[PDB]
Design an enzyme around this catalytic site. Structure first.
Site, PDB file in Angstrom:
ATOM      1  N   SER A 175      67.270   6.910  52.121  1.00 48.49           N
ATOM      2  CA  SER A 175      68.318   7.067  51.120  1.00 48.49           C
ATOM      3  C   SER A 175      67.764   7.326  49.726  1.00 48.49           C
ATOM      4  CB  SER A 175      69.215   5.825  51.098  1.00 48.49           C
ATOM      5  OG  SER A 175      68.445   4.646  50.935  1.00 48.49           O
ATOM      6  N   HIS A 231      51.467  -0.016  58.846  1.00 47.41           N
ATOM      7  CA  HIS A 231      51.997  -0.368  60.154  1.00 47.41           C
ATOM      8  C   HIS A 231      51.116  -1.364  60.899  1.00 47.41           C
ATOM      9  CE1 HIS A 231      54.292   3.724  60.169  1.00 47.41           C
ATOM     10  NE2 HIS A 231      54.982   2.779  59.556  1.00 47.41           N
ATOM     11  N   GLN A 270      47.221   5.791  58.168  1.00 46.65           N
ATOM     12  CA  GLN A 270      48.446   5.328  58.806  1.00 46.65           C
ATOM     13  C   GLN A 270      48.413   5.544  60.311  1.00 46.65           C
ATOM     14  OE1 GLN A 270      51.989   5.131  56.577  1.00 46.65           O
ATOM     15  NE2 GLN A 270      53.168   6.326  58.067  1.00 46.65           N
ATOM     16  N   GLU A 271      47.945   6.704  60.775  1.00 47.43           N
ATOM     17  CA  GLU A 271      48.088   7.025  62.187  1.00 47.43           C
ATOM     18  C   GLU A 271      46.868   7.769  62.722  1.00 47.43           C
ATOM     19  OE1 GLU A 271      51.595   9.297  61.899  1.00 47.43           O
ATOM     20  OE2 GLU A 271      52.901   7.551  61.639  1.00 47.43           O
ATOM     21  N   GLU A 288      56.557   3.763  67.170  1.00 50.29           N
ATOM     22  CA  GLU A 288      56.170   5.006  67.858  1.00 50.29           C
ATOM     23  C   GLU A 288      55.595   4.802  69.251  1.00 50.29           C
ATOM     24  OE1 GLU A 288      56.931   8.155  66.732  1.00 50.29           O
ATOM     25  OE2 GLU A 288      58.086   7.266  65.105  1.00 50.29           O
ATOM     26  N   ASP A 331      46.700  10.840  60.391  1.00 51.90           N
ATOM     27  CA  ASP A 331      47.768  10.803  59.397  1.00 51.90           C
ATOM     28  C   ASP A 331      47.328   9.761  58.382  1.00 51.90           C
ATOM     29  OD1 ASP A 331      50.351  10.973  58.045  1.00 51.90           O
ATOM     30  OD2 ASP A 331      50.829   9.104  59.090  1.00 51.90           O
ATOM     31  N   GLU A 349      46.805  14.874  58.308  1.00 52.88           N
ATOM     32  CA  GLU A 349      48.107  14.910  57.664  1.00 52.88           C
ATOM     33  C   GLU A 349      48.092  13.984  56.463  1.00 52.88           C
ATOM     34  OE1 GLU A 349      51.564  14.072  60.133  1.00 52.88           O
ATOM     35  OE2 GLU A 349      52.435  12.979  58.442  1.00 52.88           O
ATOM     36  N   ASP A 409      53.189  16.284  54.783  1.00 51.53           N
ATOM     37  CA  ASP A 409      54.415  15.547  55.077  1.00 51.53           C
ATOM     38  C   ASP A 409      55.166  15.120  53.823  1.00 51.53           C
ATOM     39  OD1 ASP A 409      56.346  14.410  56.662  1.00 51.53           O
ATOM     40  OD2 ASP A 409      55.284  12.497  56.860  1.00 51.53           O
ATOM     41  N   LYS A 442      60.829  17.691  59.496  1.00 50.84           N
ATOM     42  CA  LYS A 442      61.739  16.623  59.886  1.00 50.84           C
ATOM     43  C   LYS A 442      63.150  17.089  59.566  1.00 50.84           C
ATOM     44  CE  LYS A 442      58.362  12.869  59.077  1.00 50.84           C
ATOM     45  NZ  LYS A 442      58.067  11.845  58.007  1.00 50.84           N
ATOM     46  N   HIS A 460      59.266  13.623  64.789  1.00 55.76           N
ATOM     47  CA  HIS A 460      60.183  12.516  64.954  1.00 55.76           C
ATOM     48  C   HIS A 460      60.428  11.771  63.635  1.00 55.76           C
ATOM     49  CE1 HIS A 460      56.143  10.848  65.414  1.00 55.76           C
ATOM     50  NE2 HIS A 460      56.682  10.016  64.555  1.00 55.76           N
ATOM     51  N   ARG A 461      61.167  10.669  63.741  1.00 55.25           N
ATOM     52  CA  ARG A 461      61.315   9.679  62.688  1.00 55.25           C
ATOM     53  C   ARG A 461      60.987   8.303  63.255  1.00 55.25           C
ATOM     54  NH1 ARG A 461      63.137  11.941  57.846  1.00 55.25           N
ATOM     55  NH2 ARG A 461      62.501   9.925  57.011  1.00 55.25           N
ATOM     56  N   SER A 462      60.817   7.331  62.350  1.00 54.06           N
ATOM     57  CA  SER A 462      60.522   5.960  62.767  1.00 54.06           C
ATOM     58  C   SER A 462      61.668   5.376  63.586  1.00 54.06           C
ATOM     59  CB  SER A 462      60.239   5.086  61.546  1.00 54.06           C
ATOM     60  OG  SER A 462      61.188   5.323  60.521  1.00 54.06           O
ATOM     61  N   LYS A 492      55.286  16.595  67.337  1.00 55.46           N
ATOM     62  CA  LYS A 492      54.823  15.243  67.046  1.00 55.46           C
ATOM     63  C   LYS A 492      56.028  14.345  67.272  1.00 55.46           C
ATOM     64  CE  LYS A 492      53.161  12.313  63.312  1.00 55.46           C
ATOM     65  NZ  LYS A 492      53.210  12.170  61.833  1.00 55.46           N
TER      66      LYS A 492
HETATM   67 MG   LIG Z   1      53.959  10.975  58.007  1.00 59.59          MG
END
Ligand SMILES: [Mg+2]
Lengths: 352, 104, 434
Positions: free
Chosen positions: C42, C155, C163-164, C205, C242, C291, C318, C343, C371-373, C394
């Protein structure tokens, strides 16, 4: 001291200012492509010298005429009378005065009367024009068209009649703005300028005109009437001298609020300063629609004739007329189905 | 109404928007009433069961109505609202009035 | 028959237990489409904004009743009567009805739900598959998956700043074999972590977040799992990162502070030092994609990273681009990055999503549908990836049906395509030399 204005009104569409009375079906005869409205006193006088009072009594006392004992022409033809000259006046047949036909069963069972003085001639009262002018001025002033115009201190919202000060107040100088605006009434403009238009409603959600059984006596399009507006104070003088350019602003707000949702071929175009006079023009033309929106709709939410969204457009049917203005040939309406915006007029205000 | 019919798209919209399942009922004066008092009034004869209810509202400005068709003497299809009609239109009513100060 | 007749939104739950909405579109002939919206954000200066209630008594302020009311009372009155195949006209009408650049008035979630529902209803009306409707007859390429396996940073509590971490089975002959390779590597890593005493509980994920020593430890465990499954790293399965360096970037000091996640023993790097660290990691390990290697506003650092590493390693923006045509065009002009993450709810409609994908393809960049979370049982992004022939997807790990649904839909698409289906793998990295 006093500033006197002349307001020239040109009706671009039929205008009806009723008085509560109604011609029933037993007061006018449709014949020879005209509507004759005999005076019932002279009618009775010349059918007491012809000895038909008793059957006339049986014709008018009669409570439930079925289909044809409800029409005066039926009585005239049944008893073989051909002496149709008992005062009254005649209205030329428009063509478009009503759906179905003016003959047969339904036709026109009621005709709403125009306001007439004691001599029987029609006129436009000064209080009607003053009400229209008051709506124009109140709807184009941020100190009057705000949230303070509603009175929520009660069961239901209603107009704050004391938002504009009026009346005598104890120990205070007179502060009545609208006592200064003294709008006079017209002169009797003869019975030859009247027609028998019928109310149609155009819904934006449905996109077709629906006729209604509500027939009226209205001034014909392109009728010139003259009013005198005498003003005494400088405040009301400035307001009246700005009546043009305030009518345009009110109409611009009205078009951007209501008239924009309907097809542009039904909405009329303006030659002079716009105004809306008489009955059948719509509720938004008689309200501060910026504030009245939501409340007026809720007034009718639990009725059968529900007000859906902002409502329907009132489009009567009267013959198409073209004005030879010194710019070209201006047709009054932009549609070929002969759809006038009932209650519309234009005006020009000078300072004679 | 014989010149027109209910359109198929509006009928479908009314069908699975389920507007008929949310009817409103009115008395003889056109005031909204519950189905129980509507039934009571219809039974006692104080309400006309025909013109006393509404099928909610169909959303989406759909046209309610389509033209209805018929067969000509040739056996061809034709819209019911088109034809010989009549012939009376005049030209116009040119009212001169070449003096009105038209505002810009 | 193809006229849209009913549009109806309802409030459902996403994969995280948070509310979202789904929109059902019915046409006159009876064609039906259901569009489910993933959970987004938001907030954002130049990204589409979803509408949430803000009532703390209901779902912690994450209710979607406002967007449902927007669909049912505003959008439905405007879309009913359209042709279901007029997807571009419907999306343009919704965008104009919103009247705001970020779609904050109606809500981006509402607009995306109506968009996906209209597209699916049009595919149902035409009795064609969704990818055939979206991309035409020439839809043949099964995307190369970047399967999340190990995650850190925000995460995880491990001292890993990135992050990933993902495995890219680009050497597989078909998508089905690529999915099998990734599942087998996933289970081999699960066995290795169980042997090592680390946690095997999945995150959002489907990927593990165990307590490694550092990034290097994570990458060596990834390679160990790849070889335990029986595949050659660097030939069969590659490694992607990522970094999400926008999270640990000190904006004022213009330094990438690894101390936010990797403890006090970590190093504080500049832009040039960050490029040096990324190049060293690429030289040590078979890393094919990185990323968010720079901050979302570090434009010169992004440029310098693209000049240093963009010929051999795919660099995905991203937060750099946030699926925005303006940012993507500026990056193309400045030679920043060579890939974009797409996205669909970050932009709000399928029309502008496909516009961004087409612009990225025309610039030589690769589009990665993401995707999204918080996801759903909807798998429209698989049809988007096949329809555009993007060749890269992804959609998470191999562990939850918010992730597995897209892989299953890609399996169905490959089966339906049959002999026409093409899995390119390394050939789908057309942004890289040779
Ligand atoms: Mg990302």
């Amino acid at each position: 001291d006093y500033r006197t204005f002349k307001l020239s009104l040109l009706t671009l569409a039929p205008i009806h200012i009723g008085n509560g009375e109604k011609y029933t079906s037993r007061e006018f005869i449709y014949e020879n492509k005209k509507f004759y409205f005999p005076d019932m006193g002279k009618f009775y006088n010349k059918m007491v010298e012809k000895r038909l009072a008793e059957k006339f009594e049986a014709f008018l006392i009669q409570t439930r005429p079925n289909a044809r004992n409800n029409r005066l022409i039926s009585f005239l033809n049944d008893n073989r009378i051909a002496e149709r000259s008992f005062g009254g006046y005649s209205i030329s047949e428009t063509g478009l005065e009503s759906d179905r036909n003016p003959n047969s069963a339904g036709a026109i069972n009621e005709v709403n009367k125009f306001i007439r003085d004691a001599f029987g001639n029609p006129y436009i009262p000064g209080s009607s024009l003053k009400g229209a002018i008051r709506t124009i001025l109140m709807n184009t002033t941020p100190k009057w068209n705000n949230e303070n115009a509603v009175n929520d201190f009660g069961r239901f919202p209603k107009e704050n009649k004391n938002l504009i000060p009026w009346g005598p107040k104890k120990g205070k100088e007179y502060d009545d703005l609208f006592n200064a605006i003294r709008v006079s009434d017209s002169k009797p403009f003869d019975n030859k300028r009247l027609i028998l238009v019928q109310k149609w409603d155009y819904s934006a959600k449905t996109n077709k005109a629906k006729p209604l059984p509500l027939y009226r006596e209205s001034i014909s399009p392109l009728t010139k009437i003259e009013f005198e507006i005498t003003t005494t104070t400088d405040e009301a003088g400035r307001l009246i001298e700005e009546l043009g350019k305030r009518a345009q602003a009110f109409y611009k707000d009205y078009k951007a609020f209501f008239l924009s949702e309907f097809p542009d071929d039904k909405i009329q175009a303006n030659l002079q300063y716009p105004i809306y006079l008489g009955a059948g023009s719509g509720a938004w033309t008689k309200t501060l629609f910026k504030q009245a929106d939501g409340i007026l709709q809720r007034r009718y939410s639990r009725m059968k004739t529900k007000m859906v969204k902002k409502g329907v457009l009132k489009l009567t049917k009267a013959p198409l007329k073209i004005v030879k203005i010194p710019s070209g040939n201006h047709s009054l309406i932009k549609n070929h189905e002969s759809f006038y915006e009932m209650g519309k007029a234009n005006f020009m205000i000078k300072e004679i | 109404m014989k010149n027109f019919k209910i359109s198929s798209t509006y009928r479908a919209a009314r069908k699975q928007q389920k507007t008929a399942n949310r009817k409103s009922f009115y008395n003889d004066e056109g005031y909204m009433i519950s189905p129980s008092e509507w039934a009571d009034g219809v039974i006692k004869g104080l309400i006309n069961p025909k013109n006393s209810w509404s099928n909610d509202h169909v959303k989406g400005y759909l046209p309610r109505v389509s033209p209805r068709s018929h067969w000509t003497k040739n056996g061809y299809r034709e819209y019911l609202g088109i034809g010989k009609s009549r012939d009376i239109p005049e030209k116009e009513p040119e009212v001169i009035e070449m003096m009105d100060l038209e505002l810009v | 028959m193809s006229i849209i007749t009913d549009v109806y939104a309802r409030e459902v739950l996403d994969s995280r237990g948070n509310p979202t909405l789904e929109v059902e579109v019915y046409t006159e002939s009876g064609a039906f489409g259901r569009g489910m919206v993933p959970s987004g954000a938001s907030t954002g200066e130049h990204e589409a904004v979803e509408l949430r209630d803000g009532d703390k008594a209901r779902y912690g302020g994450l209710g979607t009743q406002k967007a449902v009311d927007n669909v049912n009372n505003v959008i439905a009155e405007h879309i009913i009567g359209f042709d279901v195949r007029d997807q571009q006209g419907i999306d343009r009408a919704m965008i104009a009805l919103d009247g705001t650049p970020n779609k904050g008035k109606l809500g981006a979630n509402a607009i995306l739900g109506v968009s996906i529902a209209v597209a699916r209803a049009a595919a149902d009306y035409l009795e064609v598959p969704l990818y055939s409707y979206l991309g035409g007859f020439n839809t043949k390429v099964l995307p190369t998956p970047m399967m999340n396996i190990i995650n850190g940073g925000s995460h995880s509590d491990a001292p890993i700043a990135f992050q990933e971490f993902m495995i890219v089975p680009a050497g597989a002959p078909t998508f089905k074999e690529a999915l099998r390779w990734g599942a087998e590597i996933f289970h081999a890593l699960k066995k290795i972590l169980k042997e090592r005493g680390l946690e095997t509980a999945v995150g959002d994920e489907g990927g593990f977040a165990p307590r490694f020593n550092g990034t290097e430890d994570g990458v060596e465990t990834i390679i160990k799992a790849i070889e335990a499954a029986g595949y050659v790293p660097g030939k069969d399965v590659f490694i992607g990162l990522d970094c999400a360096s926008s999270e640990f970037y000190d904006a004022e000091h213009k330094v990438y502070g690894y101390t936010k996640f990797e403890g006090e023993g970590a190093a504080v790097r500049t832009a040039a030092e960050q490029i040096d660290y990324l190049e060293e990691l690429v030289n040590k390990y078979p890393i094919i994609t990185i990323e968010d290697g720079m901050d979302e506003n570090d434009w010169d650092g992004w440029k310098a990273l693209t000049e240093r590493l963009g010929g051999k390693v795919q660099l995905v923006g991203d937060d750099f681009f946030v699926t925005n045509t303006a940012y993507l065009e500026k990056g193309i002009a400045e030679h920043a990055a060579n890939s974009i993450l797409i996205k669909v709810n970050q932009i709000g409609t399928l029309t502008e999503t496909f516009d961004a994908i087409e612009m990225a393809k025309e610039a030589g960049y690769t589009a990665v549908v993401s995707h999204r979370s918080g996801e759903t049982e909807d798998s429209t992004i698989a049809d988007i990836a096949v329809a555009t022939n993007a060749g890269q997807i992804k959609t998470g790990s191999l562990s939850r049906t918010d992730r597995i649904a897209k892989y299953n839909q890609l399996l169905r698409i490959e089966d339906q395509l049959g002999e026409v289906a093409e899995y390119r793998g390394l050939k789908s990295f057309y942004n890289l030399k040779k």
